[model samples]
Target: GPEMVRGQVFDVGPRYTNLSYIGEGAYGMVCSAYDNVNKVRVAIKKISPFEHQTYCQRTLREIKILLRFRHENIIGINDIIRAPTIEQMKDVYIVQDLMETDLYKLLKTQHLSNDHICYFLYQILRGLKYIHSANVLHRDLKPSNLLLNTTCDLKICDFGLARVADPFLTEYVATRWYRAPEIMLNSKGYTKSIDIWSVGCILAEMLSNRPIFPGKHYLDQLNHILGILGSPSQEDLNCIINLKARNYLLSLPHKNKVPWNRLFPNADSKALDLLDKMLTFNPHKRIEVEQALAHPYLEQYYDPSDEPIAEAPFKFDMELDDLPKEKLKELIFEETARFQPGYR
Candidate 1:
């Protein structure tokens, strides 16, 4: 809480100390602490679940996904700390690997070198391949979601909106600025390419030091997208499930595509070429993880063998979508029980 829940203090064991509040977001609160036993710095994320069903659902999904997919570029779920009894469970504590700063934080203040950008993007794609190979979509992938250390190692975090990319694709929120055209258009069919589109926005932002699509609202959002990438083709418009969005794109006068050179002058053309492939308006025409990794822009960092994948797919219970607040609380307690004192 404001200062480690001075009231209903959560049990984090005496070994963990010096909890300084670090981040506060829509979903939860984060703090950095020192682990006495491990002698390492760790992030203690406190999720207050009872306030909403979405809170509990995201808690369960992230815990499961983080536990399954383990890689250098993926945030490590070191431990889960919760109450000893379900009746007493008010908050769930997730102990994660602590990083020095997030991409969003640094992107705002510092100037990263070309090699830094190359390595940062390389790690993101590498981590993403591992996630997709397991049939999971990191529905939320923005600068803030990317964690970096003093040494510059980047790990992808926040699987709260992430889910298996099975046929059961459901719509959810990702930062609108980085959302894919199909996502903004409300298309019926979805794919892993949606994540690729977000990557393009992230890449452009990193290179230009600002959001490529900084829209004020949904309508304004679409305008920012069209403003830079230009209007989509009639065929691309056909994919829209929402009529208003389709008609709006059709009614607008034709706009010329903004030259990447003009947008990112003094940058490497190879990087700009890859950016074009990533920012493709049509998800179907967009680049896949493998090909993107193989691009000459990151040829120095490419290695198919080292980019590992999940041993099995991640599939969440479909019922979570329909479950009520009370049911989700029980479900969350069921998961928190796994890390209780007596459990092996």
Candidate 2:
């Protein structure tokens, strides 16, 4: 069972070894690895053995999802390999095409700058369109999962948590900050429109360089939403019946009416308008990803030339057989003990 469940190891050399540690999450650390045989740059997701079950299976599922589609917008997994180690009998590795920086870090250092944000948004929408068309939901759509290639190209990554929807069922898989209202209310019957809400949050964050409705709790979150988007109408309320916080809405605060303009004071009018549309509380009223891609706000900054065209500067190199068994075991044990305090 361990052999079947654990991943198999493959060869690694200078070609597959890379320099940069680009991004990380609860599951693993993503680094830039080079494929020597192919002479191409790749992303290597090194999973912890602690992620022994569902997370590992999800990694395999992500590979399956990528193999089924060929799109420039979705970051594709290039290959899967095993890490050689006397300590780790079969260390599994997921190899993917390398991306430059993720949107999270990019936004922290740079301004939206022209139509770049729009172009990125369009690529994301196009990718989502492809995913939805394939009956998949990218449950997580935060900036960290959204990466940029060398040419400033945007692509969606980290599909480990993605759901294969029934094409009609609403998917409530997304981060809380970018989560849609329906998901917040616990309504399980929805569609790809949930992604649109995340896109809206991303766009708003890009415009402001900060989170929009960073509510303290679920109720606080709802109040933050009602404050900007205005209270959900009876029709809007009806669609969110299954949500976890549905009961709290009955006594939600009706004050703090900060319009979109006031919320993102520095954003251009077109950007603000698009943000308003995407952040709509009513999922039915929310625009589709494709429609949002075509919104005028995106047109101002969209550029096809920005896609990942250059290679990353690093590679992955680990010689498992060369290490002493005890040393390898020690490395594993030390790494296992090193964990970060989880963030909200």
Candidate 3:
């Protein structure tokens, strides 16, 4: 093993060389490395998840999903480098095609046109359709998770928080701004619609160059949301299974719904309509990913055969079990081994 820039350690194969820094995180750091064997650039994320149960679970879960969920719109796994066996493995290295920027950064620096907004939104919904088809929830769908390259190609990444869709999901899954009403209000649970809300928020941000629901806190966040969307109807409130959250809205002053045209005066009618459908108060009322792809806003790009679904729904065997740390490590080792030659 040798240290690269920032003194990061790598036990990667000889094919990977010229390691440099990309960014750092709480778990570990990502670095840019040249793939001599393939004559390309790759991102190497070295993470040590062997120290705890939760980390192990997340690491293994992410690796499994990334390996299984292969699509043009979804980030592809190029390789994974780890110790020869589970007992010897201490850290794992994940390799993937290097992306130039993220949706968040593009929104920050670029002045986008309707074409850009439409294409980006369409791609997000397209990728999401495939994800939900496999019975998985991204759980985190903020702009930052949407990876982009210079040619306007986008691939959804960051599967650490993604999971096999479960009915009784926990709260606080997504970033507050992009979070859906069901997750924020603690509804019975959420479905794939939660991801649609995030797409709507990102769409709005791209249109306005600012966060649509920039809440400073949970209470304040809910207030700003209600303020814009108008107070949820009694029918909408009923969807919230959490009484405390339901009653809190009841105590608030009724708000009048803001017209989309008024807020986005210059936006195309078709774009505004999509935004309205995406940001509906109730998750059930929200437009679905499949329906969203078929919306008139993305009419030119929509093709029935172009959009795809997984061969079968993802299983939840690991999430359903309380496996020990050793077993998790073994599973993780197997995942990395899948990329190794002559290891099958």
Candidate 4:
């Protein structure tokens, strides 16, 4: 493991230098380093695989997805550093291009113009289009997970919570603020449309300079949504396959839907129209990412070339949770070798 200190040089690997602590979380510590061989700055995340099985699985899954994905709006993994021998395995390092800041920090300090808002949303949709096209669902799509540079280039990152679109996938994934109605209601058959709902929330938050649904709990979160979007119609509620969720919605007081203009008094009409479509309670009715990129609101920036060609659906070689600690380590090491053949 490399020592992390401010203004001190350390070896992330033979090619990376000047590693310094940037931040730390439950999974690992982050450091900024210079890619000496490539002559570029990079962010390196170090994860100790033995700390916990859950964290190890997450780290491997994230690495796998990043290695397989390719898009300008999606973060790229530059390189991976692992021990040469199994006996010395301790830390795994993931090196990624360094961005100025994340959307969460950027939004906190400044307000965006309409152009900025639309372009940002455009890139997000573009990235998501690629992800969904590959049959992968980015379960977490909040602002904090979006990386940005000074040029306002937004790239979606943080795939620790992402998964293949499985019909039986659990609903307790995305953060509460941007969670979809289907997820909040504990639906079993949710799909990639949940990410569209999250994009709607992010767009609203970017425009309003506050979270659209800032609720304290699951119940309160539903209440906040109902208060603004109004109660789901019987048709919509009936579509909810979850019995408890449907009964709970039935018990709540009925409220008339609020107009989009009222909700976003200063937003462009086209923007509001798109937002309305994205935030629909019925997942089936929600705007798909491809349609969203072509919406009138983003017409000025939409380019046919920006649309990603559907790639072969991503397939996982093994189930992360079911694998033993040494198996997980071997799998991750193999992935690194496959991606960066000259690393060792």
Candidate 5:
């Protein structure tokens, strides 16, 4: 074990050298290390099962989904390390490609050029296209989840909050600032469009160096959205099948639409147009990732090959959620064994 340096402990295994603390997340801590065998730097995330069953479940889902991904814009898993004995199975470590920083931290100090904005957005859409085509929804799409190299190459990471697409999804999924109106309204029929809303928010943040809708609360989030996009139309309101949510919207004061030009005066017209389509009030009306990629704003970086094609229909065992702690551990052990066959 290694003592804390700058408030982070860095101790993993002999296979990795020069271990340095990176950051911490809800699941566990992260560190940067050099792989003695692979001969490259890597990021190692430690998932602690001691937290709760929910954290364990998220860690399992993230591992499963990352194993299935094979795209340049999506983060890649290098290896999964676990203790040899069942008694020490309470901790799991995932080894992944190392990056200089994440988009959130990068944006804090650097002012992006228009080209930077376009390329970054293109890559984000490219990643989303692949994720969505695989029938998986990255329920949490935020700047912090987007990893970057010094060259500005981006990869989407942190799939703990992601899930396979289905009709029934939790209402409280994405972070509040980037959450879509349908998600805020607790609409059951919400689809992949929710991710599109988050892309729009990130786009705006990159341009302005601030969050587009910085809401203090869920109700305030809706108000911030309405204040910018104006009130939802009667047709938009009708699209919400949730009666309670619809009534709540009706009770709010009417708001006139804000001109896009006025809001994004400095943005390229095409960029603003794409942002408009993405941030639409109705989920059905939001731009698809594929369509967003084709927009003129991103045309320079667009390549048909960049779109993720389904190798096979994304499939997973849904019963993982119902398994008990011991069963879940067994299942996870089996899953990781596919990669780390030597693990007992």
Candidate 6:
């Protein structure tokens, strides 16, 4: 394979031009590529010239945002490699550490114990806290974007929608379900509060094992949100975009709340309480990541040294080793696609 640097090119030994396709997305496909220089595992993302041109800024934007902050709970981007290939029109590539699976995938076969969820959520908040402290918001946040190392350590990924918070300006960029009230209404001046809203949605999903807002449209989705948090007031409605109908819903009785107790019926009180605070409807009132980390829910499950939570529902299963990469990728893709109007 020949490596291209800007317009110049260099010849390298027969490289793994035939990558193992692992995943696909709006931009392109992800594959497992063998790097001869490092002799290490790397997840490589490939995109066409046009797609690369379109996403180049966004991708580099995410890279810049990532470079500003580093945390144990955040996914690591090792490098951006311009793959050496000339047989076909070359594409841009991003090299990142490979993870065993994302949280969404982990949840499918294994019902997380309360302690596990608590531990996981704490790590999530820790990542979010770092992002927020860096004056950035992870506009798109969901369980699928929460990658896990082999040891089950959590790290947040996918920052394409992230933006540095500007107190004087309002920007809306997250998925609809995780979209905060301020962004929904097109309120011209919102900030990190938007990320808090995403955290809430993620917490709710962890508790319910399903999406909190499975509505078909924006209005219906808003209703689903109101169903749990109670209808929004005129002020709340005004803060969001295209929520004029929210005024009418305010008069209607609040639907049955999906409280933590009922959602995670078997979860510990401490975990549920924390989930409640994280999922609060009012963005201004939502629990901040730092505050959430300090909450009793996490405090109860964390161990000062080494691994936290002594209990786990998933016992070691030798059967997992025989699973093919295609099968694993198919399972994750199928399950992730099941949730419409929502993206990891």
Best by TM-score: 1
| lDDT (tens digit, per residue) of candidate 6 on 96-175 | 77777887787787777666777788788777777776666677888888988778699898775566566522222335
- Which ranges of candidate 4 are over 4 A from the true structure? 6-13, 167-174, 321-327, 339-344
Please give the range of 10 consecutive residues that has the lowest summed lDDT in model 4: 166-175
lDDT of 3 by residue, 1-344 (tens): 56566765787758898888877666778888899999999999898888777677778777888889989889988888887767788889989999888888888888789999999888888899999999998878888889999889999998876776666332223358988878778774448888888899999998889899999898888887888999988889788889998888899999998898888898989999999999998888889998999999999999979999999998756552367778888888866776767786
lDDT, candidate 2, 186-265, per-residue tens: 67634677778888888888877787878777667766677777766778767675644555675665654568777766
Model 6 stretches astray by more than 4 angstroms:
1-18, 49-57, 83-90, 168-175, 233-258, 300-344
RMSD of each: 2.5, 11.1, 2.3, 2.8, 2.3, 13.2
Q: Which prediction has more favorable lDDT, 1 or 3?
A: 3
For model 4, state the Cα shift of residue 204 in Å: 0.5
Assess candidate 6 and give its lDDT: 0.61
Segments in model 5 whose C-alpha atoms lie over 4 Å from true places: 1-11, 168-174, 320-327, 339-344
Which candidate number would show the highest lDDT if scored against the true structure?
3
lDDT value for candidate 3? 0.84
Whole-model Cα lDDT per candidate? Answer: 0.83, 0.64, 0.84, 0.82, 0.82, 0.61
Q: Which ten residues in a row have the lowest lDDT in candidate 6?
A: 308-317
Give the deviation of candidate 6 from the true structure as CA RMSD. Answer: 13.2
Off by over 4 Å in 2: 1-11, 18-20, 49-54, 83-90, 167-175, 243-245, 299-344
Per-residue lDDT, model 5, residue 299, is 82
Off by over 4 Å in 1: 1-10, 167-174, 241-244
How many clashing pairs in candidate 3? 0
lDDT of 1 by residue, 276-326 (tens): 999988777899988999999999999998999888887775657657778
